[PDB]
Amino acid sequence: DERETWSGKVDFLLSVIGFAVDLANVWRFPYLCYKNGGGAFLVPYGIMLAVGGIPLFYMELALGQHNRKGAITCWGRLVPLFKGIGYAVVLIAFYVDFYYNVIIAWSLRFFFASFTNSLPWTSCNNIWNTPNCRPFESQGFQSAASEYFNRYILELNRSEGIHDLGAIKWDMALCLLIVYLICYFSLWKGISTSGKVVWFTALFPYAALLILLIRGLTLPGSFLGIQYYLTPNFSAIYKAEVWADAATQVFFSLGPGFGVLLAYASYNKYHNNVYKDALLTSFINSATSFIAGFVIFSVLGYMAHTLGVRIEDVATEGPGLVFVVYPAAIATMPASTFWALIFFMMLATLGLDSSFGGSEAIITALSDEFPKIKRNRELFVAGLFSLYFVVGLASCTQGGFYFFHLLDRYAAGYSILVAVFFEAIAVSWIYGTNRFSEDIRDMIGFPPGRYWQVCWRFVAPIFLLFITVYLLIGYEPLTYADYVYPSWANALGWCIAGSSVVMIPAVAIFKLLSTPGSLRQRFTILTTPWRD
């Protein structure tokens, strides 16, 4: 085994921080803090972060560095029976890349829309607005920026549902094209160039959040937003759904077991201290979500106090924050064009490296499993991103938000919880915390503390089971803004998630069938790792 390496420890650290620090940090965590008790919510968030989140982060990073192989081969060597975990994680990342890059396309479309002297989401007079336009959010009316997003950027109103996708928006197809060009030319030559490009796509978000914070805190009414954001209401942490929300946010915010950390740590020097790296980058993604919460809510308090808009209306998660509420706040402050440009460039750079992560997980896993691809990386990556583009043209249609919202709901989440549960079982129970502690000792020089072993062994599977149970309990059929998705759309989304999950027991059974002996010998032969 002779493989390339990062060409610098800071390239690894910035790649992992870039992948981890997603838009979920900006548009999800602050909403949860506000909704789920303010600063009190950091007690659940911090507990679930410590017992279960960082353990699985450190676990996948140590596995990836030890095995020096991608997801498919790492999982096929640690527990051959569970080689299906590698295919599951790769296929999950493959589905995630169809929808996730649309958010970056929207970010670039707003960035390119921002160059006008007056920002087009400022006003209700424009042709795409209805008589129900009002300048800012109101009950039973649409804001000017909501009108702009739904009716000019998306044109979502001209589509009658997921079945009626309508015509391609070619400005959006061109923005998704530019997204995939930046991804291609960042991932074709491999970590040699990806590790350099993340010096921008992982450091610009902090270079923006700094000034976006200085601005937001110097706006009249920012302390009111900070109060709404962090006022402690400790009764809130006595509810189980608060803890489930904290754990789901932790798990998906870090992304432990998504296959990306294997693909990256695979390129570490074998004796690199992955323990410090796991701690450093887990802290940096939690603190980045926290600081982003101030960046957001300072401006949300500015809206609630100055623009005369109710706080319950603007404080929202997901696209309707960064593409509707926050631009509607930006358009009302001096040098609005500048804040618009940097804000949407920040969103694009929060997304870009997060998509590099998934794409690099797929490319490393397949190039490690198939040498034919390893020698032809530039051509495989061109075929891959051309596939992504031609599928993503569905998202670039008028009804494309319904395709985005469906894939976003079902692609990854149910399945990735199931995969990471089986990863925690395979490592901690079948392979062993003893063997894995020996492997970590041999790499970094000291065995993992008893805290980490008890976590990996007992807490992390119960942690993922708690998440999955409270994620299935709150299941409700998919709806988006008074549009109830047809039942066949939910069936298709369950086929997506199930196709991701079925790879685990399908490959398990195929392995069990293809190995000779009686059942005890088949299990033994498929349980012994590859070096033992």
Partner: antibody, heavy 119, light 109 residues
């Protein structure tokens, strides 16, 4: 307290063979990587071999590799060094040294046992 | 292998003097992988200092460690009658785990 008691070791003809054995007690032997460390009659300490906590990572020095074989008996808390094709300059006192954490060195040492290789 | 040379090979120090002995590696050791052992005449070595600065368990507080890179040092502030031993530096950072020459501390009378 942790106690390590190296045993075996005696006169051996050059070209001969021997098995040193160290009985470890008072700690969870199964957890700790153990090293064998010899010391020539000149008090030059020389590290001989290492075995990891469960015997999956065996490291030898250039002077003894291919000839010696460190092994471990986590069921009995016994550590062994087989020595084969011994030669004159292998004559030394062989300590057993516990060394799990590389960053904390060899914390506990045994008494050592002398090997005389001579005709 | 990272050969570690210790100077001086022998040193006579009357009780009370402040003495320093230097372990010089051929190759850069990590500052948390160089250790010092005290072998009393007729007994197995004890871990004396680990990670270049940390007194091990039960080490009298007069000892100290310093240095980094390829030059490390063990220093004794107020040498006493108990310091008569041979002190060996060791690097644990890369196999082979080379011990150095050892510096013998002798009392003066």
């Amino acid at each position: 307290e942790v106690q390590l008691v190296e045993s075996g070791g005696g006169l051996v003809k050059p070209g001969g063979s021997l098995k040193l054995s160290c009985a470890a007690s008072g700690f969870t032997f199964s957890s700790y990587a153990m090293s064998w460390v010899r010391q020539s009659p000149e008090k030059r300490l020389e590290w001989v071999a290492e075995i990891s906590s469960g015997g999956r990572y065996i490291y030898y020095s250039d002077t003894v590799t291919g000839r010696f074989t460190i092994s471990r008996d986590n069921a009995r808390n016994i550590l062994h060094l087989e020595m084969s094709s011994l030669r004159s300059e292998d004559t030394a006192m062989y300590y057993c040294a516990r060394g799990e954490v590389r960053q904390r060195g060899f914390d506990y040492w045994g008494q050592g046992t002398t090997l005389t290789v001579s005709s | 292998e990272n050969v570690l040379t210790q100077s001086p090979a022998i040193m006579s120090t009357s009780p009370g003097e402040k003495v320093t002995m230097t372990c010089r590696a051929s190759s850069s050791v990590g500052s948390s992988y160089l250790h010092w052992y005290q072998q009393k005449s007729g007994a197995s070595p004890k871990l004396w200092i680990y990670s270049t600065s940390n007194l091990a368990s039960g080490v009298p507080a007069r000892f100290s460690g310093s240095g980094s890179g390829t030059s490390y040092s063990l220093t004794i502030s107020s040498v006493e009658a108990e310091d008569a031993a041979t002190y060996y530096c060791q690097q644990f950072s890369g196999y082979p785990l080379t011990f150095g020459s050892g510096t013998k501390l002798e009392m003066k009378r």
